Every structure is written in structure tokens, then in C-alpha cells.
Curated annotation (Swiss-Prot), chain A:
It is a single-pass type I membrane protein. Glycans are attached at N34. The mature envelope protein (Env) consists of a homotrimer of non-covalently associated gp120-gp41 heterodimers. The resulting complex protrudes from the virus surface as a spike. There seems to be as few as 10 spikes on the average virion. It is found in: Virion membrane; Host cell membrane; Host endosome membrane. Residues 1-27 form a coiled coil. Residues 22-41 are annotated as: MPER. Acts as a class I viral fusion protein. Under the current model, the protein has at least 3 conformational states: pre-fusion native state, pre-hairpin intermediate state, and post-fusion hairpin state. During fusion of viral and target intracellular membranes, the coiled coil regions (heptad repeats) assume a trimer-of-hairpins structure, positioning the fusion peptide in close proximity to the C-terminal region of the ectodomain. The formation of this structure appears to drive apposition and subsequent fusion of viral and target cell membranes. It comes from Human immunodeficiency virus type 1 group M subtype B (isolate LW123) (HIV-1). This is Transmembrane protein gp41.
UniProtKB/Swiss-Prot annotation, chain B:
The mature envelope protein (Env) consists of a homotrimer of non-covalently associated gp120-gp41 heterodimers. The resulting complex protrudes from the virus surface as a spike. There seems to be as few as 10 spikes on the average virion. It is found in: Virion membrane; Host cell membrane; Host endosome membrane. It is a single-pass type I membrane protein. Acts as a class I viral fusion protein. Under the current model, the protein has at least 3 conformational states: pre-fusion native state, pre-hairpin intermediate state, and post-fusion hairpin state. During fusion of viral and target intracellular membranes, the coiled coil regions (heptad repeats) assume a trimer-of-hairpins structure, positioning the fusion peptide in close proximity to the C-terminal region of the ectodomain. The formation of this structure appears to drive apposition and subsequent fusion of viral and target cell membranes. The gene is env. Residues 3-37 form a coiled coil. This is Transmembrane protein gp41. The lineage of its organism: Viruses, Riboviria, Pararnavirae, Artverviricota, Revtraviricetes. Glycans are attached at N7, N44.
Amino acid sequence: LIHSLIEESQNQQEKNEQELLELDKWASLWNWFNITNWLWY
Amino acid sequence: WDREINNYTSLIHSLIEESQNQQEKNEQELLELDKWASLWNWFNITNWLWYIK
Ligand code: NA
């Protein structure tokens, strides 16, 4: 039971690392948009 | 990065870190519980061998 729960916990830690990566990707695109809009303004 | 973006990434980083800290704490607690189970199993095995000797 406990071993199963630890693995489940670890899977959540991974799911959170993937969200962090997805966050930094959106932020990067939003930043790109702001810079590009500024260059072309 | 712009202010709007920094307010956004600051929030999401803070929220994910908190969830990660909680998961790490849960893991360390599960490990504690595993040690407690091991201790309990040792008493139980000792008791059973004493009863069957
Ligand atoms: Na940058």
C-alpha cells in the first residue's frame, strides 16, 4: 500500500514538473509577442 | 519580461512549488510510515515465533 502511494506521490511530482515546463513555454510565447509587438510598433 | 508576465509566472511558480513541497513532505511521511510498519512487523514476527516454538 505504502509503496503504491509513494509511486503515486512521485507521479504527481512529475505531473507538476510538466506543468512548470508548460508554464515556462506560455510565458516564453507571451514574452515573444510583447517583444515582437514592440519591435514592430 | 513585462509586469503582467512576471505576475503570472510568479504566481504559477509559487503555486507549483507549494504543491511540490507538499508532495515531498507526503513522500517523507510515507517513508516514516514504512519504517513504522517494519518495526510493527518485527514485533509481530517475534511474537509468532515465540508462540510456535
Ligand atoms: Na528572455
